[PDB]
Amino acid sequence: FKFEFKFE
Amino acid sequence: FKFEFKFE
Amino acid sequence: FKFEFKFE
Amino acid sequence: FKFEFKFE
Amino acid sequence: FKFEFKFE
Amino acid sequence: FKFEFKFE
Amino acid sequence: FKFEFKFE
Amino acid sequence: FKFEFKFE
Amino acid sequence: FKFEFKFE
Amino acid sequence: FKFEFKFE
Amino acid sequence: FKFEFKFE
Amino acid sequence: FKFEFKFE
Amino acid sequence: FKFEFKFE
Amino acid sequence: FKFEFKFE
Amino acid sequence: FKFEFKFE
Amino acid sequence: FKFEFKFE
Amino acid sequence: FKFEFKFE
Amino acid sequence: FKFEFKFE
Amino acid sequence: FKFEFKFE
Amino acid sequence: FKFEFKFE
Amino acid sequence: FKFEFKFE
Amino acid sequence: FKFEFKFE
Amino acid sequence: FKFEFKFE
Amino acid sequence: FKFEFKFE
Amino acid sequence: FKFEFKFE
Amino acid sequence: FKFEFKFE
Amino acid sequence: FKFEFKFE
Amino acid sequence: FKFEFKFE
Amino acid sequence: FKFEFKFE
Amino acid sequence: FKFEFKFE
Amino acid sequence: FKFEFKFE
Amino acid sequence: FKFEFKFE
Amino acid sequence: FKFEFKFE
Amino acid sequence: FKFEFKFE
Amino acid sequence: FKFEFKFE
Amino acid sequence: FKFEFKFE
Amino acid sequence: FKFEFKFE
Amino acid sequence: FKFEFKFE
Amino acid sequence: FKFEFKFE
Amino acid sequence: FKFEFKFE
Amino acid sequence: FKFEFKFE
Amino acid sequence: FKFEFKFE
Amino acid sequence: FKFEFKFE
Amino acid sequence: FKFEFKFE
Amino acid sequence: FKFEFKFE
Amino acid sequence: FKFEFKFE
Amino acid sequence: FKFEFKFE
Amino acid sequence: FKFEFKFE
Amino acid sequence: FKFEFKFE
Amino acid sequence: FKFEFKFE
Amino acid sequence: FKFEFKFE
Amino acid sequence: FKFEFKFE
Amino acid sequence: FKFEFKFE
Amino acid sequence: FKFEFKFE
Amino acid sequence: FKFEFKFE
Amino acid sequence: FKFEFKFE
Amino acid sequence: FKFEFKFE
Amino acid sequence: FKFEFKFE
Amino acid sequence: FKFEFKFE
Amino acid sequence: FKFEFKFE
Amino acid sequence: FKFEFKFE
Amino acid sequence: FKFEFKFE
Amino acid sequence: FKFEFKFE
Amino acid sequence: FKFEFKFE
Amino acid sequence: FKFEFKFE
Amino acid sequence: FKFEFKFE
Amino acid sequence: FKFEFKFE
Amino acid sequence: FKFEFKFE
Amino acid sequence: FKFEFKFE
Amino acid sequence: FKFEFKFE
Amino acid sequence: FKFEFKFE
Amino acid sequence: FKFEFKFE
Amino acid sequence: FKFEFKFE
Amino acid sequence: FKFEFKFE
Amino acid sequence: FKFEFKFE
Amino acid sequence: FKFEFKFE
Amino acid sequence: FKFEFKFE
Amino acid sequence: FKFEFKFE
Amino acid sequence: FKFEFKFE
Amino acid sequence: FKFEFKFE
Amino acid sequence: FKFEFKFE
Amino acid sequence: FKFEFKFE
Amino acid sequence: FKFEFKFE
Amino acid sequence: FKFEFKFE
Amino acid sequence: FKFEFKFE
Amino acid sequence: FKFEFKFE
Amino acid sequence: FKFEFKFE
Amino acid sequence: FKFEFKFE
Amino acid sequence: FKFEFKFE
Amino acid sequence: FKFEFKFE
Amino acid sequence: FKFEFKFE
Amino acid sequence: FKFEFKFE
Amino acid sequence: FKFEFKFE
Amino acid sequence: FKFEFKFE
Amino acid sequence: FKFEFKFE
Amino acid sequence: FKFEFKFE
Amino acid sequence: FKFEFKFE
Amino acid sequence: FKFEFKFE
Amino acid sequence: FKFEFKFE
Amino acid sequence: FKFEFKFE
Amino acid sequence: FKFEFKFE
Amino acid sequence: FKFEFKFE
Amino acid sequence: FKFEFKFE
Amino acid sequence: FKFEFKFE
Amino acid sequence: FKFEFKFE
Amino acid sequence: FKFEFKFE
Amino acid sequence: FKFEFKFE
Amino acid sequence: FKFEFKFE
Amino acid sequence: FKFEFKFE
Amino acid sequence: FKFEFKFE
Amino acid sequence: FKFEFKFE
Amino acid sequence: FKFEFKFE
Amino acid sequence: FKFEFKFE
Amino acid sequence: FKFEFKFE
Amino acid sequence: FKFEFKFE
Amino acid sequence: FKFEFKFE
Amino acid sequence: FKFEFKFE
Amino acid sequence: FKFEFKFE
Amino acid sequence: FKFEFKFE
Amino acid sequence: FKFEFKFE
Amino acid sequence: FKFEFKFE
Amino acid sequence: FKFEFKFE
Amino acid sequence: FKFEFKFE
Amino acid sequence: FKFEFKFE
Amino acid sequence: FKFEFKFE
Amino acid sequence: FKFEFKFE
Amino acid sequence: FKFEFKFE
Amino acid sequence: FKFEFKFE
Amino acid sequence: FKFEFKFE
Amino acid sequence: FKFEFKFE
Amino acid sequence: FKFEFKFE
Amino acid sequence: FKFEFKFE
Amino acid sequence: FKFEFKFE
Amino acid sequence: FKFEFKFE
Amino acid sequence: FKFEFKFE
Amino acid sequence: FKFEFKFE
Amino acid sequence: FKFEFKFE
Amino acid sequence: FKFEFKFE
Amino acid sequence: FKFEFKFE
Amino acid sequence: FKFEFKFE
Amino acid sequence: FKFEFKFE
Amino acid sequence: FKFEFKFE
Amino acid sequence: FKFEFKFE
Amino acid sequence: FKFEFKFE
């Protein structure tokens, strides 16, 4: 399982 | 306002 | 899986 | 008011 | 997949 | 009141 | 695909 | 009461 | 495609 | 009561 | 295409 | 009770 | 095209 | 703002 | 069971 | 900021 | 039951 | 920073 | 029972 | 459009 | 579009 | 009972 | 779109 | 009782 | 989209 | 009582 | 998205 | 009373 | 996302 | 009273 | 994530 | 009064 | 995780 | 007054 | 886990 | 004033 | 109180 | 008070 | 008070 | 006050 | 005050 | 004030 | 003030 | 002010 | 001010 | 200002 | 300012 | 600014 | 600034 | 900045 | 900066 | 910087 | 820097 | 640096 | 103990 | 006991 | 005891 | 002890 | 005692 | 002692 | 006494 | 002594 | 006395 | 002596 | 006197 | 003498 | 006088 | 004379 | 005067 | 003359 | 003047 | 002239 | 192991 | 293992 | 494994 | 494995 | 082991 | 694997 | 694999 | 072991 | 793979 | 051992 | 050992 | 041993 | 030994 | 021995 | 020996 | 011997 | 011998 | 012999 | 695009 | 993007 | 993409 | 990405 | 991916 | 990643 | 992975 | 990792 | 490691 | 290990 | 190692 | 070991 | 080694 | 792993 | 060993 | 070796 | 041995 | 060897 | 408010 | 032992 | 042991 | 409000 | 162990 | 309201 | 273990 | 209302 | 494991 | 109402 | 895994 | 009402 | 995966 | 009522 | 993918 | 009642 | 795409 | 009852 | 209004 | 298990 | 109105 | 177990 | 309004 | 399993 | 009215 | 056990 | 599996 | 507003 | 009326 | 698979 | 036990 | 009336 | 695939 | 605002 | 009456 | 026991 997030 | 999402 | 969002 | 959406 | 929205 | 929609 | 709406 | 609709 | 409506 | 409709 | 309606 | 209709 | 109706 | 997640 | 997290 | 978790 | 944790 | 836990 | 109704 | 009804 | 009703 | 209603 | 109502 | 309502 | 209401 | 409301 | 309200 | 509100 | 409010 | 607010 | 507020 | 705030 | 605040 | 804060 | 603060 | 702090 | 009008 | 209108 | 209009 | 509009 | 528009 | 729009 | 748009 | 959009 | 978009 | 997005 | 995305 | 993400 | 991710 | 993660 | 992870 | 971990 | 672990 | 451990 | 009453 | 009366 | 009166 | 009243 | 009045 | 009032 | 007025 | 008011 | 006004 | 106000 | 304003 | 203000 | 502003 | 301010 | 600012 | 500041 | 800063 | 500082 | 028994 | 039993 | 039994 | 049984 | 019993 | 049995 | 059985 | 009994 | 059997 | 009893 | 009794 | 009693 | 009595 | 009494 | 009395 | 009294 | 009286 | 008195 | 294939 | 497949 | 397979 | 499978 | 298997 | 299984 | 088995 | 099991 | 057991 | 047994 | 036991 | 027995 | 006993 | 068994 | 007996 | 006894 | 008796 | 006795 | 008690 | 008490 | 109690 | 209790 | 209790 | 209980 | 209980 | 239970 | 239960 | 269960 | 269950 | 189940 | 089930 | 299933 | 199923 | 299926 | 299916 | 299908 | 109940 | 009910 | 029930 | 209820 | 209750 | 029902 | 049921 | 209630 | 039913 | 209560 | 059923 | 049915 | 309450 | 069925 | 049917 | 209470 | 069927 | 309260 993998996950990645970016904001701004 | 900017957003990003990654899954799998 | 990929996702991208923009507001404004 | 502006919006954007991206998928896949 | 693409999407775009405008209001006002 | 004004509206817009884009798809594809 | 395109869409447009007006009210008033 | 006034209305408008656009498609395609 | 076009559309127009009036009421009243 | 009054009504109107336009198409095409 | 055109349309018109009256009631009353 | 009164009615009206227009077409074309 | 024309149309008219009365009741009563 | 950056984020990451791993599971399994 | 395994887990991993990253921030920044 | 880094994190880790193990279970079982 | 077992558990393990790491930080930094 | 390191941690450990055992139960049962 | 009893009943009564008027329209128009 | 008057109505009258009796039951029983 | 008037209405009249009586019960009982 | 009694009842009454008007539209338009 | 006017409305009128009476009960009892 | 009594009731009244207007739209538009 | 105006509204009017009276009770009692 | 009394009531009033406007939208748009 | 303006709003107007009055009570009493 | 009185009330007022604006969005956007 | 602006807001405006008045009471009384 | 009075009120005001801005986001983003 | 900016914020603005005024009261009174 | 007055208020102001920034995140991130 | 920066913060900014002003009052008065 | 004034305020400021940093984490991490 | 660093911290920074300023007041006034 | 000023402030500073470190953990770990 | 139905009314049909077929033309064809 | 229905009203049917076929045209084919 | 229905009204149908079939064209086909 | 329904209004039907078929076109096929 | 419904309005349907079927095309097919 | 509903408005239906079928296209198939 | 609903609005449906079915395509299929 | 709802807006429905079906596509199948 | 809802907006639904069903695809299937 | 909700926004629904179904895909199945 | 909600946003739902259902896939299934 | 909520964001829902269902996957089943 | 919530974010939900339901898988099931 | 909450983040929900359901898995069942 | 919360983070929930529900498995069940 | 909370971190929730449910397992049932 | 909390950490919860619920099992049940 | 709290650490919660529920088991029921 | 129902009682149906159709008109049209 | 059920009772229908369909006039049309 | 139930009572329907469907006008249309 | 219901009482249905349909119009349309 | 319940009372419905559905106009449409 | 309810009283339903549908419009549409 | 309860009172509904659903417009749509 | 409630009073419901739906719009949409 | 309670009063709801749900717009949507 | 409540007063609900929903939007969406 | 209580007053809610839920936008969503 | 409360005043609720939800956003989301 | 109390005042809430919940953003989420 | 409180003032609540939630974020999340 | 009290003032809360809960971020989460 | 308090001032609360929650984070988490 | 009191000031809290609770991080968790 | 206090100043609270919680961590956890 | 259901069982229905409708009489009417 | 359903079992239906109609009697009218 | 359904089973219906209609008598009428 | 349905099984229908009509008797009239 | 449900058991349904309708009477109208 | 249906099976109907009509007697009348 | 349907199977019809009429007897009258 | 449910049991329903509907009369109407 | 239908099969009808009419006797009468 | 539930027991339902509807009367309308 | 529940027991419901709905009248309406 | 609950006991429900609805009246509307 | 509960007992509920809802009137509306 | 609770006793509930709702009135709306 | 509780007793609740809700009016609204 | 508690006694609850809500009024809204 | 408690007694609560909530108004709102 | 307590006595509670809430007003909001 | 919709596609049916009915075999029977 | 549906695909129907009937058999019987 | 949706796919049905109805056998009966 | 659904897949329906009916039998009966 | 969702999968149904309805047998009846 | 669901899997439905109906029987009846 | 979720799994339902509904028997009825 | 759920497993539903309905009966009825 | 839960285990639900409903009856009714 | 948790275990529920809800009878109703 | 809990054990729930509901009745009602 | 914990044990609940809730009767209601 | 607890033992709960609720009544109501 | 969760497990439900609902009988009704 | 602890023992509760809550009657209400 | 406690023993709780609640009443209310 | 401890013993409580709380009446309220 | 205590003995508690609450009243209220 | 009389009381009576006996132990042992 | 024995006990006795009077209030008021 | 033994226990006894009287109220009122 | 008599009570009786025996343990052991 | 053993237990016994009487009310009323 | 008699009770009987045995454990172990 | 073992368990036993009697009511009434 | 007798009960019997055995585990393990 | 093992389980057993008797009612009535 | 006997029950039997075995897992694993 | 394995599973087994008996009713009645 | 016997049941048998095996997974994996 | 694999699956197996027996009824009756 | 035996069942057999294999996926993948 | 692949699929397989047996009944009876 | 055997079944076989392959996709893609 | 591709498809395949076998019955019997 | 074999089947074969190809699209696109 | 009158009511009477018996059990056992 | 015996039951009785009286109404009116 | 009268009612009577027996089980077992 | 005996019960009684009176209303109005 | 009047009410009366009897138990036992 | 035995059952009985009486009405009227 | 009379009813009787047997199972097993 | 006897009870009484008066309102209005 | 055996069944019985009696009516009237 | 008036209220009256009696017990015993 | 009489009925009898057998399966297996 | 065997079946039986009796009527009258 | 006697009670009284007055409001307004 | 008699009936008999066999399959397989 | 084999079948049988008997009547009378 | 006024209030009055009597006991005994 | 007799019937027999064979397929394959 | 007598009481009084005045507010505003």
Q: What share of chain DD is helix, strand, coil (3-state, %, to 5)?
A: 0, 25, 75
Distance between CY2 CA and the closest CA of chain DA, angstroms = 5
Task: Say if residues DQ1 and DR8 touch (Cβ distance below 8 Å).
Answer: yes
AL4 with AK5: Cβ contact below 8 A: yes
Pairing of strands BI6-7, BJ6-7: parallel
Q: Which residues pair with AG2 in a beta bridge?
A: AH6
What is the per-residue DSSP string for CT1-8? -----EE-
Chains in contact with BV, where contact requires at least 3 CB pairs less than 8 Å apart = BU, BW, CS
How many CB atoms are closer than 10 A to CB AT7?
Answer: 22
Task: Say if residues DH6 and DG4 touch (Cβ distance below 8 Å).
Answer: no
Q: How far apart are the first and last CA of chain BC?
A: 23
Distance between EC5 CA and the closest CA of chain EB, angstroms = 5
Q: If interface means Cβ-Cβ distance under 8 Å, which residues of chain BI face chain BH?
A: 1-8
How many CB atoms are closer than 10 A to CB BR8?
Answer: 20
Spatial neighbors of AM3 by CB under 8 A, at least 6 apart, are AL2, AL3, AL5, AN2, AN3, AN4
Q: What share of chain U is helix, strand, coil (3-state, %, to 5)?
A: 0, 75, 25
Q: If interface means Cβ-Cβ distance under 8 Å, which residues of chain DX face chain DW?
A: 2-8
Name which of DK7, CJ5, DS5, AD3 is nearest BO1 in CA terms.
Answer: AD3
Question: What whole-number distance in Å separates Cα of residue CT5 and Cα of residue DP3?
Answer: 11
Angle CZ3-CZ4-CZ7 from CA coordinates, rounded to 5°: 150
Question: What whole-number distance in Å separates Cα of residue L4 and Cα of residue BR1?
Answer: 71
Task: Say if residues CG2 and CH4 touch (Cβ distance below 8 Å).
Answer: yes
Task: Say if residues CQ2 and CP2 touch (Cβ distance below 8 Å).
Answer: yes
Phi, psi (5° rounding) for residue Q5? Answer: -145, 145
CA DS2 to chain centre: 9
> CA nearest CL2 in CK: which residue?
CK2
Task: Say if residues AS2 and BL6 touch (Cβ distance below 8 Å).
Answer: no
Name which of CX1, H7, AQ6 is nearest AR4 in CA terms.
Answer: AQ6
Cα-based distances in Å from U1 to L1, U4, U7? 9, 10, 20
How many CB atoms are closer than 10 A to CB BA8?
Answer: 16
AS6 with AT2: Cβ contact below 8 A: no
Q: CB-based burial of residue AS5 (10 Å sphere; 0-12 exposed, 13-18 middle, 19+ buried)?
A: buried
In the block, tokens 């904001």 appear at: A7
The residue type at BS5? F
Tokens of CB2: 């449910």
Name which of BZ5, CO2, EM3, BZ1 is nearest CM8 in CA terms.
Answer: BZ1
Tokens of AI1: 């886990």
CA R2 to chain centre: 9
Q: If interface means Cβ-Cβ distance under 8 Å, which residues of chain BY face chain CZ?
A: 1-2
Q: Which residues pair with DU3 in a beta bridge?
A: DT7, DV5
The residue type at CY6? K
Burial R1-8 (b: 16+ CB within 10 A, else e): eebeeeee
Tokens of CJ1: 């011997």
Tokens of AH5: 């804060």
Question: What whole-number distance in Å separates Cα of residue EB3 and Cα of residue EC2?
Answer: 12
> CA nearest EL5 in EI: which residue?
EI5
Tokens of AZ6: 């449910």
Name which of BX2, CM1, BW4 is nearest CP6 in CA terms.
Answer: BX2
Measured between beta carbons, the chain EG residues lying within 8 angstroms of EE5 are 2-5
Q: Which residues pair with P4 in a beta bridge?
A: O4, Q6
Measured between beta carbons, the chain DO residues lying within 8 angstroms of DN2 are 6-8
Question: What whole-number distance in Å separates Cα of residue EB2 and Cα of residue BA2?
Answer: 57
Tokens of DV6: 């190809």
Spatial neighbors of Z6 by CB under 8 A, at least 6 apart, are Y1, Y2, Y3, AA2, AA3, AA4, AA5
The residue type at BO3? F
The residue type at H1? F
Q: Which residues pair with J2 in a beta bridge?
A: K6
Q: How far apart are the first and last CA of chain AQ?
A: 23
Name which of M1, AU3, AO5 is nearest B5 in CA terms.
Answer: AU3
Question: What whole-number distance in Å separates Cα of residue BQ1 and Cα of residue AX2?
Answer: 29
Question: What whole-number distance in Å separates Cα of residue CR4 and Cα of residue CR1?
Answer: 10
Question: What whole-number distance in Å separates Cα of residue BZ4 and Cα of residue BC7?
Answer: 35
How many CB atoms are closer than 10 A to CB EN1?
Answer: 10
Distance between DO8 CA and the closest CA of chain DP, angstroms = 7
Task: Say if residues EL3 and EI7 touch (Cβ distance below 8 Å).
Answer: yes
Cα-based distances in Å from O5 to A7, Q6, AS8, AW1, DR3? 17, 11, 36, 20, 43
CA X8 to chain centre: 12
Classify CM7 as helix, strand or coil: strand
Q: CB-based burial of residue P7 (10 Å sphere; 0-12 exposed, 13-18 middle, 19+ buried)?
A: middle
Q: CB-based burial of residue BF1 (10 Å sphere; 0-12 exposed, 13-18 middle, 19+ buried)?
A: middle
Q: If interface means Cβ-Cβ distance under 8 Å, which residues of chain G face chain F?
A: 1-8
Question: What whole-number distance in Å separates Cα of residue CT4 and Cα of residue CT6?
Answer: 6
Spatial neighbors of CV1 by CB under 8 A, at least 6 apart, are BA8, BB8, CU1, CU2, CU3, CW1
* H or E element at residue DW2: strand DW2-7
Pairing of strands S2-6, T2-6: antiparallel
Q: According to the entry, how was the structure determined?
A: cryo-EM
How many CB atoms are closer than 10 A to CB EK8?
Answer: 11
How many alpha carbons lie under 13 Å from residue CM1 in its C-beta half-sphere?
A: 3
Cα-based distances in Å from EB4 to G3, BR5, EH5? 63, 65, 22
Question: What whole-number distance in Å separates Cα of residue DH7 and Cα of residue DI4?
Answer: 7
Question: What whole-number distance in Å separates Cα of residue BU3 and Cα of residue BV3?
Answer: 5
How many CB atoms are closer than 10 A to CB BO4?
Answer: 17
Name which of BE2, BV6, DZ4, BY5 is nearest EB8 in CA terms.
Answer: BY5
Pairing of strands EB2-7, DQ2-6: unpaired
Spatial neighbors of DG2 by CB under 8 A, at least 6 apart, are DE6, DE7, DE8, DH5, DH6
Task: Say if residues BF6 and BE8 touch (Cβ distance below 8 Å).
Answer: yes
Task: Say if residues DY5 and CB1 touch (Cβ distance below 8 Å).
Answer: no
Question: What whole-number distance in Å separates Cα of residue BW5 and Cα of residue BX4?
Answer: 7
Measured between beta carbons, the chain BL residues lying within 8 angstroms of AS2 are 8
What is the per-residue DSSP string for AK1-8? -----B--
How many CB atoms are closer than 10 A to CB AK6?
Answer: 10
How many alpha carbons lie under 13 Å from residue DX7 in its C-beta half-sphere?
A: 14
Question: What whole-number distance in Å separates Cα of residue EG1 and Cα of residue EG4?
Answer: 11
How many alpha carbons lie under 13 Å from residue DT7 in its C-beta half-sphere?
A: 14
G5 with F2: Cβ contact below 8 A: yes
Question: What whole-number distance in Å separates Cα of residue R1 and Cα of residue R6?
Answer: 18
Task: Say if residues BE2 and BD1 touch (Cβ distance below 8 Å).
Answer: no
Tokens of DD3: 């003995």
Task: Say if residues AY5 and A1 touch (Cβ distance below 8 Å).
Answer: no
Task: Say if residues AB6 and AA1 touch (Cβ distance below 8 Å).
Answer: yes
Q: CB-based burial of residue AO3 (10 Å sphere; 0-12 exposed, 13-18 middle, 19+ buried)?
A: buried
How many alpha carbons lie under 13 Å from residue R7 in its C-beta half-sphere?
A: 10
Question: What whole-number distance in Å separates Cα of residue DY5 and Cα of residue DX4?
Answer: 6
Tokens of A2: 């993998």
Q: Which residues pair with BK7 in a beta bridge?
A: BL7
Pairing of strands BG6-7, AG2-7: unpaired
BD5 with BC5: Cβ contact below 8 A: yes
Classify EK6 as helix, strand or coil: strand
Residues in chain EC: 8
Question: What whole-number distance in Å separates Cα of residue C2 and Cα of residue CO6?
Answer: 34
In the block, tokens 């502003």 appear at: BO5
Question: What whole-number distance in Å separates Cα of residue C3 and Cα of residue AV4?
Answer: 13
The residue type at EB2? K
Name which of AD7, BK7, CF2 is nearest CW7 in CA terms.
Answer: CF2
Phi, psi (5° rounding) for residue AS5? Answer: -145, 95
DSSP for residue DZ4: E
Alpha-carbon torsion S6, S7, T2, T7, what sign?
Answer: negative
Tokens of E8: 């006002």
Question: What whole-number distance in Å separates Cα of residue DH2 and Cα of residue DF7?
Answer: 18
* AL and CC touch per CB criterion (3+ pairs under 8 A): no
Distance between EI6 CA and the closest CA of chain EF, angstroms = 5
Task: Say if residues CQ8 and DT1 touch (Cβ distance below 8 Å).
Answer: no
Pairing of strands BD6-7, AJ2-6: unpaired
CA U7 to chain centre: 8
Question: What whole-number distance in Å separates Cα of residue AR8 and Cα of residue AS6?
Answer: 8
Q: Which residues pair with DZ3 in a beta bridge?
A: DW5, EA7
DSSP for residue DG2: E
Q: Which residues pair with DV5 in a beta bridge?
A: DU3
CA DD1 to chain centre: 12
Question: What whole-number distance in Å separates Cα of residue DN3 and Cα of residue DM8?
Answer: 12
CT3 with CZ6: Cβ contact below 8 A: no
CA CS5 to chain centre: 2
Q: Which residues pair with BK5 in a beta bridge?
A: none
Classify D6 as helix, strand or coil: strand
Pairing of strands CQ6-7, CR6-7: parallel
- 3-state SS string for CA1-8: CCCCCECC
In the block, tokens 């009276």 appear at: Y6
Tokens of DI6: 């009487």
Task: Say if residues DP7 and CT1 touch (Cβ distance below 8 Å).
Answer: no
Task: Say if residues DE8 and DF1 touch (Cβ distance below 8 Å).
Answer: yes
Task: Say if residues BJ2 and BH3 touch (Cβ distance below 8 Å).
Answer: no
Distance between AV3 CA and the closest CA of chain AU, angstroms = 5
The residue type at EE1? F
Name which of CX1, BA1, AL6, EB2 is nearest BT7 in CA terms.
Answer: BA1
Q: Which residues pair with BT7 in a beta bridge?
A: BS7
Question: What whole-number distance in Å separates Cα of residue BH4 and Cα of residue BG1?
Answer: 11
Question: What whole-number distance in Å separates Cα of residue CB4 and Cα of residue DK6?
Answer: 27
Nearest neighbour of BK2 by CB, restricted to BL2, BL5, BL6? BL2
Residues in chain BX: 8
